[PDB]
């Protein structure tokens, strides 16, 4: 139930969440993540202001007629390295510890995959650059990022080797529907969730934001983010961190890496997390 029933967290703190996680009551964790988990990897959030008309470049109709701007922007914004963050590897540890039901991400940077989350573990709600497809319905040839990268840097508009149609990265352009996978997984996963870990997202983009309202009433929800988010708008379920009726929502305010480190430390996972990150970062740095 809600605040009227007995609550699962013994206290509304990171410490309470950790105790819950290590109890038999918590078996399945869903992560909801956004751009805030990749900024420390040097991938800016293109929605953060500090980073025909401007919006055309992300519209599917404009792209199909004039793809060159998008692909020029893609070359300019292409990360110099793909090194997932502590937050990404914390989710890998959740997987290793048998706690990860699913990671729903709004990011297109592939860092979840690089950090060791597999397709089954992931719902890329806004799509991804990881794969691309020929846009012709009768073809739909798939291309890997290695192929798309070469086209982007060579400044050659990517065309299908089979039919010469445009090849589009599998991101959800505006005007496109979210992937069917998002809706199908959401319908199943939120019947099964014991904990919702919301990291590095302001929960301002829909329908991704509405996911928090899909959790059972009793399911604790931990937000690790620079700012509080997910509360109902006094003008326009929602997060309740602070009222007298608060019973399950916890906000840890700071950088995602530091929050995940703090949680891992409480869990006795800090050495495991350090060892994993340092090994994988070393491996990525040594790519030859
Ligand atoms: C080029 C490249 C390759 C790889 C692997 N990673 C990167 S990361 C840096 C970056 O930002 N690179 C970058 C390069 C070119 C273009 C963009 C813009 O990306 C997106 C991604 C998703 C959306 N769609 C929604 O938000 C949405 C739709 N419907 N709804 C409801 C919501 C829109 C734009 C990013 N960049
Ligand atoms: Zn084709």
> Please, which residues have CB less than 5 A from ligand 2, an ion?
134, 136, 139, 141, 160, 162-163, 165
In the beta sheet, which residues pair with residue 142?
Answer: 133
Tell me how far apart the alpha carbons of residues 209 and 214 are, in angstroms, rounded to a whole number.
10
The three-point CA angle 90-91-93 to 5° equals 65
CA pair distance 227, 223, nearest whole angstrom: 9
Instruction: Report the DSSP pairing between strands 167-171 and 195-199.
Output: unpaired
Q: Whose CA is nearest to atom 5 of ligand 1?
A: 109
Q: In terms of C-beta density within 10 A (0-12 exposed, 13-18 middle, 19 or more buried), how is residue 205 classed?
A: middle
Sign (positive or negative) of CA dihedral 2, 224, 282, 270: negative
Closest ligand to the CA of 141:
2
- In 3D, which of 32, 15, 5 has the Cα closest to residue 195? 32
Binding residue positions for Zn(2+): 134, 139, 160, 163
What CATH code is assigned to 40-84+126-179?
3.30.1600.10
**What per-residue string of b and e applies to 68-101 under the rule 16 or more CB within 10 Å gives b?**
eebbeebeeeeeeebbbbbbbbbbbbbbeeebbb
111 neighbors 87 (Cβ within 8 angstroms)? no
Q: In this structure, what DSSP letter does residue 197 have?
A: E
The yes-or-no answer on residue 133 being catalytic is no
Instruction: Report DSSP state, residue 166.
Output: B
Q: How far apart are CA 212 and CA 192, in angstroms?
A: 14
How far is the C-alpha of 159 from the C-alpha of 150, rounded, in Å?
A: 12
Domain extent listing, the chain: 1-39+85-125+180-287, 40-84+126-179
What are 178's two structure tokens? 């979210």
Contact assessment for residue 178 and residue 125, using Cβ atoms and an 8 Å cutoff: yes
- Which residue in 280, 273, 259 sits closest to 97, CA to CA? 273
C-alpha closest to that of 35 among 190, 152, 205: 205
- SS3 string of 205-230? CCCHHHHHHHCCCCCCEEEEECCCCC
Helix count and strand count (H, E) for the chain = 9, 9
Start-to-end CA distance of the chain, whole Å, equals 54
Residue carrying the six token digits 């540890």: 93
Task: Spell out the alpha helix ranges (H) of the chain.
Answer: 14-21, 60-65, 68-77, 86-96, 111-114, 145-154, 180-189, 256-267, 270-285
Per-residue CA distances from 239 to 41, 47, 110, 221, 243 (Å): 28, 22, 28, 8, 10
| Per-residue CA distances from 180 to 32, 120, 201 (Å) | 17, 14, 22
Question: Reported resolution in A?
Answer: 1.5
Catalytic pick among 126, 133, 141, 281? 126
CA distance 62 to 108: 20
Ligand 1 binding pocket (C-beta < 6 A) is: 43, 46, 58, 73-74, 77-79, 108-110, 126, 129, 145, 171-172, 174, 205
Using the Cα atoms of residue 54, residue 183, residue 28 and residue 101 in order, give the sign of their dihedral: negative
Give CB contacts under 8 A, 24+ apart, made by 14-17.
14/222, 14/250, 14/252, 14/259, 14/262, 14/263, 14/266, 15/266, 16/250, 17/195, 17/220, 17/222, 17/250, 17/263
Cis peptide before 207 (omega within 30 of 0): yes
Q: Looking at domain 1-39+85-125+180-287, which of 3.40.50.1220, 2.60.120.10, 3.90.550.10, 3.40.640.10 is its CATH number?
A: 3.40.50.1220
Maximum Cα–Cα distance for the chain, whole Å?
Answer: 62
Kindly give the distance from the C-alpha atom of residue 283 to the centroid of ligand 1, in angstroms, as a whole number. 26
For residue 256, give the 3-state DSSP assignment.
Answer: helix
> Any residues with CB less than 8 A from the CB of 162 and at least 6 apart, and which?
134, 139, 141
For residues 203 and 232, give the distance between their C-alpha atoms in angstroms, rounded to a whole number. Answer: 11
Residues 82, 84: Cα–Cα separation, whole Å: 6
């Amino acid at each position: 139930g809600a605040s009227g029933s007995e609550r699962l967290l013994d206290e509304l703190t990171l410490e309470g969440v950790a105790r819950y996680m290590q109890s038999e009551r918590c078996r399945r964790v869903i992560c909801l993540v956004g751009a805030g988990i990749s900024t420390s990897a040097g991938i800016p959030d293109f929605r953060s202001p500090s980073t025909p008309y401007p919006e055309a470049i992300f519209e599917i109709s404009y792209f199909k007629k004039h793809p060159e701007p998008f692909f020029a922007l893609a070359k300019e914004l292409y990360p110099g390295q793909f090194k997932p963050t502590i937050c990404h590897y914390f989710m890998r540890l959740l997987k290793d510890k048998g706690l990860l039901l699913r990671c729903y991400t709004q990011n297109i940077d592939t860092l979840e995959r690089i950090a060791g989350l597999e397709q089954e573990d992931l719902v890329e709600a806004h799509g991804t650059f990881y794969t691309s497809h020929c846009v012709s319905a009768s073809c739909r040839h798939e291309y890997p990022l290695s192929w798309m990268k070469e086209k982007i840097f060579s400044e050659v508009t990517p065309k299908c080797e089979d039919c010469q149609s445009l090849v589009k990265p599998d991101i959800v352009f505006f005007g496109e529907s979210l992937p069917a996978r998002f809706f199908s997984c959401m319908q199943s996963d939120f019947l099964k969730v014991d904990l919702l870990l919301v990291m590095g997202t302001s929960l301002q983009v829909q329908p991704f934001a509405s996911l928090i309202s899909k959790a059972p009433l009793s399911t604790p929800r931990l937000l690790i983010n620079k700012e509080k988010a997910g509360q109902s708008d006094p003008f326009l379920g929602g997060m309740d961190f602070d009222s007298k009726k608060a019973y399950r929502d916890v906000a840890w305010l700071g950088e995602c890496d530091q929050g995940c480190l703090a949680l891992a430390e409480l869990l006795g996972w800090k050495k495991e997390l350090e060892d994993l990150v340092r090994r994988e970062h070393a491996s990525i740095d040594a790519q030859s």
